[model samples]
Target: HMTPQDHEKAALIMQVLQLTADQIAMLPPEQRQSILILKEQIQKSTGAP
Candidate 1:
């Protein structure tokens, strides 16, 4: 379970690694796959949709 600090850490992760869907679409295939993997992990961790 994520506490407030975990949420804050998650927010920081987003802040440093922000990517819009449009931007992600512009990424190379390898980058896109990697980013999506990371995004999925973050969502699972934070329970974010």
Candidate 2:
């Protein structure tokens, strides 16, 4: 359920991390889930959410 903005931001982050779309898509679901969890964790820690 990613909005366009979310997808755009994710793409930017992927670029910053030097990850290709294929590389990201190849990740295990658990790793992707962890990334999502960590994103929220970081936002909370930084008081951005």
Candidate 3:
């Protein structure tokens, strides 16, 4: 359960998990696409390695 307050929660959680690009690419197609989009946005803003 999350909303504006937890809006950052999902991406932050995804970020902290430290998932690699290759790993995310191998996830189930739907899931991979979702994460890829969010992860890229976060990485672009945060400059994650």
Candidate 4:
């Protein structure tokens, strides 16, 4: 199990792994939506607005 500190680190890494808008734009339609969906999950985990 992650320590609270480890959880924070993982959250930071998850946000980093999320696609930038330009990167997402280069993805095919299905993949783009999928990445955006994943980004939302990351945002929720990170407590992002």
lDDT, each prediction: 0.49, 0.55, 0.50, 0.49
Which candidate do you rate higher for TM-score, 2 or 4? 2
Per-residue lDDT for 1-49 in model 2, tens only?
6444444454445554556857666755445444555666766766544
Q: How do all the candidates rank in terms of TM-score, highest first?
A: 2, 4, 1, 3
Residue 10's lDDT within candidate 3 is 38
Instruction: After the best TM-score superposition of candidate 3, give how far the Cα of residue 39 lies from its true spot, in angstroms.
Output: 0.7
Q: How does each model score on TM-score? A: 0.33, 0.44, 0.27, 0.34
The reply for model 4, stretches above 4 Å from the true place, is 1-26, 45-49
Query: On residues 1-49, what C-alpha lDDT tens digit does candidate 3 reach at each position?
Result: 3243344343444545564545443455445445545766866775545
lDDT of candidate 2 at residue 33, scale 0 to 100: 49
The Cα error of candidate 3 at residue 32, in Å, is: 1.3
| Each model's total of backbone clashes | 0, 0, 0, 0
Better of 1 and 2 by lDDT: 2
Candidate 3 overall Cα lDDT vs. reference?
A: 0.50
User: Which 10-residue window of candidate 4 scores lowest in summed lDDT?
Assistant: 6-15
Q: By TM-score, how accurate is candidate 2?
A: 0.44
- How accurate locally is residue 34 in candidate 1, as Cα lDDT from 0 to 100? 58
Q: Which candidate number would show the highest lDDT if scored against the true structure?
A: 2
Which predicted model would earn the best TM-score? 2
